[PDB]
From a paper:
Macrolide resistance is abundant in pathogenic bacteria, and is most often the result of GTP-dependent macrolide kinases (Mph), ribosomal methyltransferases, or efflux pumps. Mph enzymes are therefore adaptable resistance enzymes with complex evolutionary paths.
While the MphA, MphB, and MphH structures are very similar, we observed structural distinctions in all three enzymes that localized to the (a) NPL, (b) β-hairpin insert, and (c) multiple residues in the macrolide-binding cleft. As we observed in MphH, the NPL, and β-hairpin regions of both MphA and MphB adopt different conformations with macrolide binding.
Numbering used by the authors: 5 to 102, 107 to 298
Write the structure that this text describes.
Amino acid sequence: LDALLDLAARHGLDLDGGTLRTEEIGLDFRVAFARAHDGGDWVLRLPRRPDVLERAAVEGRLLAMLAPHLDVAVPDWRISTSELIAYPLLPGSPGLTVEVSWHVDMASTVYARSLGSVVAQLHAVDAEAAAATGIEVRSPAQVRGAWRQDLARVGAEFEIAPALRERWEAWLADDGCWPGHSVLTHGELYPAHTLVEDERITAVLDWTTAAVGDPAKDLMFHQVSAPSAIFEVALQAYAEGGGRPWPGLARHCTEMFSAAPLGYGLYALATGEAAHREAAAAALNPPEER
Ligand SMILES: [Cl-]
């Protein structure tokens, strides 16, 4: 426990012991919240394994370019080592906690107007400069072919219900759903990474999943959660800020969300734990309703 403060002190950040709090449940990083002697709030990301350092390396280079381009705050890494990532605690409360406690209702026009503005600014940023950070880059042809390749990989290792496959086969063949341009995307945009103050976004956490690809990636969860008119509030703010949404985008987000079992299937293959393919096989092949 006190080794954390020696670890923090070794990197020139003397924190108060009594104010230190742990958030141990995290997979990649064990997260700690602290107050310094100066009064500043600090977030400690302690890498659990060496595997997490590569995406943390790409993230730091992506955050260094990103801060000037967004109105909302983004983690300002001031310490990035093999032992600790430390940035000042960003303002705002999360829109989501995990039991399951929400802090912003998805039917809020204020949050929808905020999301569409943040996403539009993120997507407006030059992709070639974003690519130099080392993130994944996929053209509009490659984002669509990726799902084609993902379906083949999962369908080769898991039995898949025809009701689900046929829906995704129909989703992959419908030209109207698919984007014609690629942008810089957050990759996992949902309220748990959206810090809010009076239902307005003030900072965006966690950019490990950032990549150049489908613009609908960062709008999907809102499309799936919010009422139809509320999602067009976000789309209106998205368009007025430079976003270029296509008519079949809302359907595309719903179809993409129904393909989450494909994501669980790819995860269980890289992970290998039998419980993680227990749930993937159950998602890709649901039993009979009784
Ligand atoms: Cl180092």
